[PDB]
Amino acid sequence: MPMQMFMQVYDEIQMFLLEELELKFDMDPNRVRYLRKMMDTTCLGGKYNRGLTVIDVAESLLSLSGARRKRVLHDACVCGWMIEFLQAHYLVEDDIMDNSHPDVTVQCAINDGLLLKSWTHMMAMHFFADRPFLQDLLCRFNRVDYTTAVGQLYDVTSMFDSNDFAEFTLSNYKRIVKYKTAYYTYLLPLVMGLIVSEALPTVDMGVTEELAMLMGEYFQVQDDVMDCFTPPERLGKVGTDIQDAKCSWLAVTFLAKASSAQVAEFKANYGSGDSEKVATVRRLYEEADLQGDYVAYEAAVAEQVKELIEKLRLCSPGFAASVETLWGKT
Amino acid sequence: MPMQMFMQVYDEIQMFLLEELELKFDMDPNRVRYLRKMMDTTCLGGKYNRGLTVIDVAESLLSLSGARRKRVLHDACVCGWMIEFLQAHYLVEDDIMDNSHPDVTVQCAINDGLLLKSWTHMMAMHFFADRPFLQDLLCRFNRVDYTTAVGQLYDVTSMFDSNDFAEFTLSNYKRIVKYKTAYYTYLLPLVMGLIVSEALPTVDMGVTEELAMLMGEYFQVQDDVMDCFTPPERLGKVGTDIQDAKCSWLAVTFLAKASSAQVAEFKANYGSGDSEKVATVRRLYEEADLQGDYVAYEAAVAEQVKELIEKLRLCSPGFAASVETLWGKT
Ligand SMILES: CNS(=O)(=O)c1cccc(C)c1F
Ligand SMILES: CNS(=O)(=O)c1cccc(C)c1F
Ligand code: NA
């Protein structure tokens, strides 16, 4: 039912956006069908975990506060697609960075990214035109864009000096995870579920933001390990954190328990595309028993998650049930 | 005074944004100074015509409706910088398309473009937090982004078939100018001047949008001609409309008054980077007496502008005076 309702609202949102382009933006049918195909290609096919979370939080809050039910669930679907469309946007953005007479393909790719971003605003300004939370919803969506852009600056410049392994620390790793993933992957769907449920002031934002920290930290540590050791066919992509010299969990944990000679060998091989240099970094990670610390680190973070849900349970019981479901997905 | 007040508010907006990053976004001083330099580099140095227009419209409307004066003029400066910051954003975006081990310069350039875009929202959500027009201002700013993105799709795909000179017409040229330049360059500063002056419903939006059409059309026709004939040192850049096969005013006007043999020669040379092929296109433009039609076309459009200002004068006299000043700049 939640997935079935989520897909029906997609056709409703798609038909509005495309008809609006045809009726108000003077768009020819060729470009309309081109945009329908590009919208289906970039927005569909995922798991919709962050779009379905908005629905699960909304339905968990109407069970413990007829016509208002259909409105909140429909608003939560439009909100869920704002998140999926936003993720569809960055999916195309994650291709412009590793792809390179004007090139029309690069021009169309940049344009697709701009359209996917604008569609989130257009669907919100339409379906929420008479909602009292429209202004607050647009403001919180601008803040998550700023947070993500700031998180990218931290992630990209973690090995240089913005006009180098000094920033390869555990607190700076948390800072990157906080602004690049945690606030984006987990806080955004939960907060918007509270907005459409009119139960935003009924929850502790500090406890909610802290839950997103640990859940985003748990997920990013797992991603960093899989990016290094999981083979490409089983991971779904080619792990390149070592070649790109990313400030990963494996890097900052290794630099803490390694000898001076091992750090010198790490610094000499980290950040290169050579096959044996990357293999040298994997050997240094293996010999340092990092996968033993990975189990203890993930268990300790999970312990903090299971206990923080109960603090939020005391004031918002229905909200905590939906956070337990999202936490199960990670 | 208007330029002096506009620059003081810049330091106020810059200091808020940077201190906010330091105090709320956990940014180190190295990256703060890096962002101050990048903000100064991308946002300053222009002519500020579209930022100063907001001030001129605001001051022309308070003269014909103490504490409210200082508020409206300050709000108009923040609004003016939202436009200049937005233009600063596309200045960096106009470099990613013609510029191309992760490349850190391309990553920083994409990040700069995202930050410049987010800064427009952050300065609006801060200085207009208690203004009743904050929601309407954010909505109109989302629509101009959609309009610009749609205008780029029309401009980029004017010679292909979105999954070819058929779209090389005068009405389609106006469609491109409308969404890519007219609504962006001229309607945006005027409307925001009306917002901060609380005089939005007091004007005819249809007459106002129509004025932006003709003024944007007048300016784009002049740009298309200068891009072709004005030498690089006098133009300020290297004109490349012929090589990029742009749907320019010269192209659609030539195709209407040319013979079949001249159109065949045009189609054989248009859209190539060869020196003599581009020179062949310039010769075809010269021999067709296009610069004689350019004078008549610009005069006819200017006649429609001078007469449309008087229709708007009948209901909004102060608004028309500021539109006459902006029209003088073009
Ligand atoms: C305090 N919450 S917020 O600023 O509205 C917000 C919500 C969701 C995600 C982010 C990054 C965010 F900043
Ligand atoms: C009707 N006006 S609008 O939609 O708010 C608007 C204002 C300025 C520029 C653009 C493109 C725009 F669409
Ligand atoms: Na998702």
Ligand code: NA
């Ligand atoms: Na300007």
